[PDB]
Design a protein around this nucleic acid. Structure first.
Lengths: 56, 159, 168, 214, 186
RNA sequence: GUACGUGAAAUUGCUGAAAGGGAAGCAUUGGAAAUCAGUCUUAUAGGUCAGCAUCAGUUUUCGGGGGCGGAAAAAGAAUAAGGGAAGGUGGCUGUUUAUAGCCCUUGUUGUAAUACGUCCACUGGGGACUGAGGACUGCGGCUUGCCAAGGAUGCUGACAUAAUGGU
RNA sequence: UCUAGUGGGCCAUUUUUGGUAAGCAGAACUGGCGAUGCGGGAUGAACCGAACGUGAGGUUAAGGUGCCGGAAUGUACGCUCAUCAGACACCAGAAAAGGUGUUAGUUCGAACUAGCCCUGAAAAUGGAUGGCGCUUAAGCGUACUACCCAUACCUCACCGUCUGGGUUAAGAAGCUCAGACGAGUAGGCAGGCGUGGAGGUUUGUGACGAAGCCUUGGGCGUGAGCCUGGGUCGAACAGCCUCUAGUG
RNA sequence: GCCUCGUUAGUACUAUGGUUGGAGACAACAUGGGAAUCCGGGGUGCUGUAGGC
């Protein structure tokens, strides 16, 4: 019972596939103080862009 | 049979260097780490708080979170047939900047510079590194360097 | 099939050694590739220069100057055996250095079971004076009045009609 | 009606002029090396010929019992079959890549006849991921025309002199499916060439091998 | 032998519909010619979507077509909308705008509401004559992942997917592994 | 013909054919014997098997001419010099070209030749297998027609047979 | 995304643990066998070479060329004489020390050092370099050409799969051009073959012989299978599209 | 004592290869990587900010 002979061959059969890399990650895993700040900054940035678009 | 403790078989990995024991250098705390920075994990045995697992010693990853006294590092760990993202909260005592990323950044600065003067002069600039080319043809002068003839030496008994 | 090769080479120039010395060897090998390989083999063991950090500066094939003159060649070799502690000196009568070396290789393989890897040739020199020859068989060939019967006569067409004469 | 043929005739003449220039370049370089060797010999110095930049790699071992690292490397060299040949640039990255697969390939310096006879007799192109024989110059027109490679002789010059477009030209050339060598290999094929075998680097003797396998 | 990674790598495509609908076969014939004999990437897309199955061709609604065609920034208001599939009705919209829609099928309510509101309903072959190259067309799709199966696909620990339960209720997979009071929450 | 519709295989007897030296059966290839059909017979064209020619594709095996390279092969020859000793020739065991010669060095013939390496989009033969495709398109060469140029045709004979092929 | 099978493994290289040892137990990396034929090792699951559609030609790998056995009773230089020599890796097993054996070497006649041979060496049916035999080998060491042949490689023909390019002038579910590839147990999937019954269809077959049966006859298909001539027989039976199942 | 340079040293060791040698132990070779002690030469802090003499 137990051996590791075939497992590496079985592993590379379908490659050692990397996880998909996305542009934005979740603001989870981040500091709660930082995360709530970024909400307020992003909320104001969205408002600022919309007002600038409306006035231009 | 094994014992599967967190610090098992870390006798030599977490050991302090010879004549490098004692107080930790203070410059470690004065370096700023930002998200996206490349850092090399090297566990310091003196600080037993915030230690990563013995797998992450010698691994390099990208910082994703910066905390009061710690850094969040993103490592990819081989689990069977895939890569898994491992997010290790490791204190800055066990973290150092990767000189490779610096060197890349300085090379990027140089490449942008060479591109600027190339466009200013109207010429094209070679920016891609090349592997070492085969040796070129060159002359070798024997003046005051007359070749000496060598013969293999006979066997001798010298213990 | 051997050919005598003069190989000259040196280590690549460096800051510590702007003018590296040139080392030259006369060594026998079937082709230039093996000749360079053995040349780096001898330098690698003596002068601390590797094929990675060295370079062959000259390759040349040496042809026998007087191949139509019978000569005697004395060869010193460092034979390697089951014990590996052996130095041999042998003499062969031939018309060319390449021929003498090839005869030496066959003789060592036949008598002492030595391969091309085991044998390394320390030096091949031409013995010009008869009194310098110390080998009895070579001196016997140096007998002024040499003469001997022809040995191993041996002379498809199976089923010959008459019994062979196999004589003079 | 006749405009196409008029332009094609002068296109053919231009190909002839470029091939004539290439032959002059080969002759001038060969003579230049000979004179430099002669003058160095006459003056007592040593002149080292330039280290080959082009290499021809031939796979000699079958597809059975091969370690994963060597198997991947020959996959990257496109030597997926026994008796398969490729032209390859020789630099630091390639030299160490061939060092790993030394027991399974034999490589050496190809001369002008080796390159020319290979591309004429066994010259096939990778056109639309298909192995199309180089039976006409229009095939190379459609594939490497934007690279200023207009004819078979232009392709030979790019391969032989290792021009700026070596990678595209070499990748366009489907790997050569050579035959078994007439006269046979040496007695023990799977030693090193220095040991009297046939693997590893064999310097200019890849030419004698290629002549046998064509 | 040859050292080849994969052998006879069949593509995951469909060369013809699994439907036996003779009229769908006729539409396939027309759009196979259009895709083959034109450089319209639109025609290639319509041919691909004709081959697709039912679950890969979800319904779209009158309101969703109205929403996608009446965006502020987009000026795709008068352009003909194209759906390879059905166009269901949305009764939640009390007033239907004027829309010119071409699709495989229209529900009776959707078709009546469009024609009453002043628009027009076309078939794919009719749009093959009005806009044979698909110029000035808004090719849209239904929300493919709106099926019930996608509520469950990918179920596992901490995936927040729907389980296969015979009855939604209090005594049906809510205790062990679903709340921290009962051992653990997963 | 009631031991009754049809009447299979196992197994059995007789007849005919062939084989069989301690298993048999089986596969490939052909001989022998037996057996048989297509095909043609006809409407310039066509049946079966052959022989040569000119080509094409693949390959094998002998030969010639030439260029280039190396110590611009090494040698050698003929012809001029110097020097040398012998395993000592003539002369008397001993000596230095004589009544034999050899070796070393240098010049001339010589820019010698040959061998080896290498290349020719230089060339002369011999043998074998293959003939896929089926109006025209193309890329070439020649001088509009021709051509060895995007896969065999041409000229003949024998038999028209159990010949080839099948079992 | 859904699901099958598997959840007894074994051998070799190198590293290694427990063990007096083991064709022993237990691991680590890679390659094989299981699932895999083929050429060579006389023979053998994993050794060496090479991986497999049907064929023609050519050329090779490992291994070989006295005969069995296709291919030199080849070339060059040596060693060996064995009263039961030697003969090719894995491998079918042997040692210290010796020799008035012999061939060489090294150092001061002597001591040695090395190869081959012999002694050490010692079993039970008759018997195994595979056999015959082989001795200036057909033994051993080394070099050198010529030659032999795998389903491997190369050119070609054909079959199938997959892949890409064409086709409104072509049962478009058709036609056409091109390239690459072909091992397979457990397992998966696709397209076909054959059996009983049902709806439709075929101006369908049939007592002037249906079905069934036998056949040293003929034809088709890669195959499952189908068609047909001759004989026997006596009342029913089939092709195509679909339905179904107590369907091989 | 410590830090560097050389000697040790292409030595020890090691990756890949052979129907290599050897009864084994182990060794040589082919293609690559390549130390350590001993020993010898040199060296006995440099530097940032703010100031004072």
């Amino acid at each position: 019972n137990h051996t590791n002979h075939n497992q590496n061959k079985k592993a590379h059969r379908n490659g050692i596939k990397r996880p998909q890399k996305h542009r934005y990650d979740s603001l989870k895993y981040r500091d709660a103080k930082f995360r709530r700040n970024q909400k307020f900054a992003n909320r104001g940035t969205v408002e600022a862009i919309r007002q600038a678009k409306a006035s231009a | 049979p094994h014992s599967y403790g967190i610090r098992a078989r870390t006798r030599y990995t977490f050991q302090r260097g010879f004549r490098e024991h004692g107080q930790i250098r203070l410059s470690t705390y004065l370096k700023t780490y930002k998200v996206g920075d490349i850092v090399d994990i090297k566990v310091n045995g003196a600080v037993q708080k915030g230690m990563p697992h013995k797998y992450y010693h010698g691994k390099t990853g990208v910082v994703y979170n910066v905390t009061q006294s710690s850094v969040g590092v993103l490592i990819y760990k081989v689990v069977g047939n895939r890569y898994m993202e491992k997010r290790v909260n490791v204190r800055i005592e066990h973290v150092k900047h990767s000189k490779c990323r610096q060197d890349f950044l300085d090379r990027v600065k140089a490449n942008e510079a060479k591109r600027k003067e190339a466009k200013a002069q109207g010429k094209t600039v070679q920016l891609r590194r090349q592997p070492a080319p085969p040796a070129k043809a060159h002359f070798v002068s024997t003046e005051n360097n007359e070749p000496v003839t060598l013969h293999p030496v006979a066997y001798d008994t010298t213990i | 099939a051997l050919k005598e090769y003069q190989v000259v080479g040196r280590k690549v120039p460096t800051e510590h050694e702007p003018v590296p010395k040139l080392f030259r060897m006369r060594l026998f090998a079937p082709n230039e590739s093996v000749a360079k390989s053995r040349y780096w083999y001898f330098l690698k063991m003596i002068n601390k220069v590797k094929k990675a950090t060295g370079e062959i500066v000259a390759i040349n094939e040496i042809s026998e100057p007087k191949p139509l003159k019978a000569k005697v060649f004395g060869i010193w070799i460092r034979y390697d055996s089951r014990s590996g502690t052996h130095n041999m000196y042998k003499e062969f009568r031939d018309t060319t250095r390449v021929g003498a070396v090839e005869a030496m290789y066959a003789d060592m393989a036949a008598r002492h079971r030595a391969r091309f890897r085991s044998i390394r040739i320390l030096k091949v020199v031409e013995v010009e004076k008869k009194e310098d020859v110390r080998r009895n068989y070579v001196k016997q060939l140096l007998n002024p009045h040499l003469k001997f019967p022809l040995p191993h006569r041996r002379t498809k067409k199976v089923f010959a009609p008459h019994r062979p004469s196999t004589f003079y | 009606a006749a405009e196409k043929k008029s332009a094609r005739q002068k296109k053919r003449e231009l190909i002839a002029k470029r091939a004539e220039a290439y032959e002059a370049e080969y002759r001038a370089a060969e003579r230049e090396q000979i004179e430099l060797a002669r003058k160095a010999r006459a003056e007592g110095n040593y002149f080292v010929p330039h280290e080959p930049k082009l290499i021809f790699v031939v796979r000699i071992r079958g597809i059975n019992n091969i370690p994963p690292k060597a198997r991947k490397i020959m996959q990257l060299l496109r030597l997926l079959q026994i008796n398969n040949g490729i032209f390859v640039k020789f630099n630091k990255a390639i030299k160490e890549m061939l060092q790993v697969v030394e027991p399974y390939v034999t490589y050496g310096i190809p001369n002008h006849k080796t390159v020319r006879e290979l591309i004429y007799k066994r010259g096939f192109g990778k056109v639309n991921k298909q192995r199309i024989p180089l039976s006409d110059n229009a095939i190379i027109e459609a594939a490497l025309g934007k690279y200023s490679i207009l004819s078979v002789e232009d392709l030979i010059h790019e391969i032989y002199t290792v021009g700026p477009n070596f990678k595209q030209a070499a990748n366009f050339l489907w790997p050569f499916k050579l035959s078994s060598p007439l006269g046979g290999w040496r007695e023990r094929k799977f030693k090193h060439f220095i040991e009297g075998g046939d693997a590893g680097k064999r310097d200019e003797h890849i030419n004698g091998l290629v002549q046998k396998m064509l | 032998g040859i050292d080849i990674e994969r052998h006879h790598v069949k593509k995951s495509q469909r060369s013809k519909p699994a439907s036996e609908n003779v009229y769908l076969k006729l539409l396939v014939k027309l759009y196979r010619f259009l895709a083959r004999r034109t450089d319209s990437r639109f025609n290639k897309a319509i041919l691909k979507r004709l081959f697709q199955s039912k679950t890969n061709r979800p319904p779209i609604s009158i309101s969703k077509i109205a929403a996608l065609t009446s965006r502020k920034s987009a000026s795709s208001q008068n352009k003909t909308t194209v759906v390879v599939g059905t166009v269901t009705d949305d009764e939640r919209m009390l007033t239907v705008p004027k829309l010119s829609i071409a699709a495989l099928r229209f529900t009776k309510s959707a078709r009546a509401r469009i024609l009453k509101a002043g628009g027009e309903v076309l078939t794919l072959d009719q749009l093959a004559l009005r806009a044979p190259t698909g110029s000035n067309t808004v090719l849209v799709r239904g929300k493919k992942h709106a099926r019930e199966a996608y509520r469950h696909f990918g179920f596992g620990p901490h995936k927040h997917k729907a389980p296969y339960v015979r009855s939604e209720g209090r005594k049906f997979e809510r205790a062990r592994g679903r709340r921290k009071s009962r051992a653990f929450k997963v």
